[PDB]
Amino acid sequence: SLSSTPSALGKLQDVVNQNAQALNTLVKQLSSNFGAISSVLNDILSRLCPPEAEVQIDRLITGRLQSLQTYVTQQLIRAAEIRASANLAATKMSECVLGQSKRVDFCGKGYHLMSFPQSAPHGVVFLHVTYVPAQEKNFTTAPAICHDGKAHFPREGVFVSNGTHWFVTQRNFYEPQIITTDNTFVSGNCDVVIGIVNNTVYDPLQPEL
Amino acid sequence: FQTRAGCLIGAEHVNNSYECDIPIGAGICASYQQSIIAYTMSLGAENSVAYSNNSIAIPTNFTISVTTEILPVSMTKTSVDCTMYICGDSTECSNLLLQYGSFCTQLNRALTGIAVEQDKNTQEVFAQVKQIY
Amino acid sequence: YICGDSTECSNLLLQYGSFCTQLNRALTGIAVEQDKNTQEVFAQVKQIYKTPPIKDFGGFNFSQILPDPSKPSKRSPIEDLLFNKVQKFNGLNVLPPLLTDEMIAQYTSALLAGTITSGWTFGAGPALQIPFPMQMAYRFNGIGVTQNVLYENQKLIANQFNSAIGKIQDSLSSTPSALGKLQDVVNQNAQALNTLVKQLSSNFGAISSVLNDILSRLCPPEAEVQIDRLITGRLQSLQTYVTQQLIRAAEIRASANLAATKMSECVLGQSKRVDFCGKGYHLMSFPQSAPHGVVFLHVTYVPAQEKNFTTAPAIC
Amino acid sequence: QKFNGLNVLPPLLTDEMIAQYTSALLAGTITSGWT
Numbered sequence A: 001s002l003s004s005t006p007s008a009l010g011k012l013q014d015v016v017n018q019n020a021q022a023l024n025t026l027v028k029q030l031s032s033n034f035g036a037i038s039s040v041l042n043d044i045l046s047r048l049c050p051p052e053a054e055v056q057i058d059r060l061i062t063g064r065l066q067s068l069q070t071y072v073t074q075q076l077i078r079a080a081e082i083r084a085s086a087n088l089a090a091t092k093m094s095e096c097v098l099g100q101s102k103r104v105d106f107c108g109k110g111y112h113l114m115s116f117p118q119s120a121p122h123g124v125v126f127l128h129v130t131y132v133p134a135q136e137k138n139f140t141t142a143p144a145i146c147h148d149g150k151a152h153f154p155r156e157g158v159f160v161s162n163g164t165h166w167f168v169t170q171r172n173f174y175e176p177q178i179i180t181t182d183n184t185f186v187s188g189n190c191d192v193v194i195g196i197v198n199n200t201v202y203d204p205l206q207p208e209l
Numbered sequence B: 001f002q003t004r005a006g007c008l009i010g011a012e013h014v015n016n017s018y019e020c021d022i023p024i025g026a027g028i029c030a031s032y033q034q035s036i037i038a039y040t041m042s043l044g045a046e047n048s049v050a051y052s053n054n055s056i057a058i059p060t061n062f063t064i065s066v067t068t069e070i071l072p073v074s075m076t077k078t079s080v081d082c083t084m085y086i087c088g089d090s091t092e093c094s095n096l097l098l099q100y101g102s103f104c105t106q107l108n109r110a111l112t113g114i115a116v117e118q119d120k121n122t123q124e125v126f127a128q129v130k131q132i133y
Numbered sequence C: 001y002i003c004g005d006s007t008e009c010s011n012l013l014l015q016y017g018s019f020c021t022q023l024n025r026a027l028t029g030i031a032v033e034q035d036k037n038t039q040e041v042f043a044q045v046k047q048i049y050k051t052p053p054i055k056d057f058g059g060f061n062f063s064q065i066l067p068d069p070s071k072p073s074k075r076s077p078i079e080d081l082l083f084n085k086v087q088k089f090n091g092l093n094v095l096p097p098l099l100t101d102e103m104i105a106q107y108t109s110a111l112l113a114g115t116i117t118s119g120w121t122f123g124a125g126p127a128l129q130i131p132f133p134m135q136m137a138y139r140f141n142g143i144g145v146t147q148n149v150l151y152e153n154q155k156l157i158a159n160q161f162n163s164a165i166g167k168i169q170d171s172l173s174s175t176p177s178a179l180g181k182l183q184d185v186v187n188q189n190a191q192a193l194n195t196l197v198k199q200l201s202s203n204f205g206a207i208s209s210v211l212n213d214i215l216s217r218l219c220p221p222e223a224e225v226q227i228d229r230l231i232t233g234r235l236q237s238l239q240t241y242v243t244q245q246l247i248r249a250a251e252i253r254a255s256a257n258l259a260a261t262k263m264s265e266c267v268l269g270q271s272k273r274v275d276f277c278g279k280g281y282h283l284m285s286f287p288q289s290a291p292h293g294v295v296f297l298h299v300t301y302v303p304a305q306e307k308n309f310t311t312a313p314a315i316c
Numbered sequence D: 001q002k003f004n005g006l007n008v009l010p011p012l013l014t015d016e017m018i019a020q021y022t023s024a025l026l027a028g029t030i031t032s033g034w035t
Ligand SMILES: *[C@@H]1O[C@H](CO)[C@@H](O)[C@H](O)[C@H]1NC(C)=O
Pocket: A136, A137, A138, B050, B057
């Protein structure tokens, strides 16, 4: 993915290019006259006498000082942006690499499992490993099961039906199991819950005793 | 072709829609399809969810995905000799430059602060392990 | 901006180097960033989702946040409220956004439809349908409350929700300054441009701020002296403007980054971060579009009517 | 550019040192998880 895409790392290349441009601009400004007879200071000094040379020199000083001040101001603004990026990278290291995050889309798309750091020129690369659900199927569901006049709810899952039989499964991966007293809990009668359906709830100790 | 961004000449307008390649403005983008074409950008494919009051969809399989994320951490550290940049080796200029006060000192200080920060930025990101494992 | 249509000024301006190029570059960079900021916040959905023809969500009424098809704008009742509440001759131009207001509204609709029909699943992978009442049950578990509490109080909860939403329009509509946060941004930008224009009236030591009058009255060797004074002043004014725009842009970028984070963590999931997605225990949130900004509606759970009990760490 | 009074300063940490930090983080994660 990286090797076949020369521009994949543009985010880091852009930083390098911006810094290089700023320096090249600062140097090229030395060629400007700024109203002086010449941008070359030595030529002014060699041709003109003091009371006249100083007038020409002040023009170059003003221009060059202004150019240098502009450069520094831009560097301060750019530095602030880089600091913000570094602060984010440091946070991701702590939360994505040194632990497992529950923050959505913080450590890549999907459900975060783990991440690995890699070094780079003036930057860092994170490899985010995530879990993605696949191949979903349609099931019929219900909020509760009614049995012996009592309402039963899932302890850690959802009630589903394959069209003929009811099962209870974990939510993020289809794995149907028989509905029993060990995977449900009871609260109130069947007259309150809207959408409650009739089904048997198996008690493992019934056939034993 | 007349658009809200201005007058576009040389592009072939089409009534199709694609992902935005080269942005023009006001929902209009252009791409090379050969000739250059202009079109209204698409926001993505349409997907209607089969919602009902008793129907649920549950995954039966999964995949493992690995993606990359790239962040800048630091800049190149630089330093400037204010007097040399402005005056070179001229003592005539150097003396004139004294009349402007402490501008050169202020500029050097600002750049020095930036240079130091760049090392702090690196340490904050990478030096988070107490021992070398 | 500096020289107008004067070739005399234009030639003099060449002696200052590449300042004009640098200024144009800085402003161009800002303009591009503004489109990036919008995309990062709103374009977080892979596909355009739609709601059912029949709005049956178990008593939960979303009609004030969903698009109103009877209008050409296809905006919600709340969005309509938000939108209603909130120089070229000098070389100053205003560029259009890449995304139109309609496109932004469409992104918002997709996010709402996704949340209502598939909860948070569409934010991680494929959108998986679930009954809304059951989605709410899972969000109750996420805050340490058993699911039977919802099912036994479904009518009460749906009513409390519906009323709380209805109050939003009254809270906003009855308070003209409610959206000041967005109005302040608009006002600051307008002031900056007005200042830049008014500075053209300054003499800066010249006999006149009007360049044509100088050229019409004075000969070259004298006119140039007066012109240089105007160039220096106007160039300094323009440089000041750009610097301020760079600083302001940084603040906006920070805000956009926060909005993008809230979209991911408050809208596309359920947050456990305290006071990140409103006060109380977070259940869910809904996005609404606004002029140069976004509005989040945060739905939270708040405990009420506590009673005193005697307790113990253990039973023997 | 040095001749114009412009200088480039070296980083405190070398590329090798940064690589070593990265290796320690990877080794830690693989053998001991988040502990
Ligand atoms: C579920 O059923 C609907 C029709 O009611 C169908 O459109 C949809 O594709 C089905 N989903 C799956 C995963 O089979």
